[PDB]
């Protein structure tokens, strides 16, 4: 980063933002990783046992990526608008 004595680029620019502690205990789940659990019920505890999310994740979100081809059940997780349609088209259910 030394430029000869001229004020360097990483110091003539300003700092911005802050780091959020909630974002480190949150994860996202794909549709293609949704039949890799055992039991047909997709849940926070069953996703950890399948090595899909980390041990200290407390929130999860199912997004539209890949394909789902079996009927599954989702409880306690958040689902996007486009992933809610793909799950229900296969014959699934979503519960709070």
């Amino acid at each position: 980063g030394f430029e000869g004595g001229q004020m360097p680029l990483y110091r003539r620019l300003p700092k911005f933002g802050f780091t959020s502690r909630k974002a480190a205990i949150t994860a996202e789940v794909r549709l293609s990783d949704l039949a890799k659990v055992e039991g047909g019920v997709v849940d926070l505890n069953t996703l950890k046992a399948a090595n899909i999310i980390g041990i200290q994740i407390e929130f999860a979100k199912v997004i539209l990526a890949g394909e789902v081809t079996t009927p599954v059940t989702v409880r306690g997780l958040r689902v996007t608008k486009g992933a809610r349609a793909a799950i229900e088209a296969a014959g699934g259910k979503i519960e709070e």
């Binding site: 980063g1 990483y10 110091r11 620019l13 300003p14 700092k15 911005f16």
Partner: peptide, 8 residues
């Protein structure tokens, strides 16, 4: 460089 991480 910890001061570059606060800017990029």
């Amino acid at each position: 460089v910890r001061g570059a991480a606060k800017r990029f």
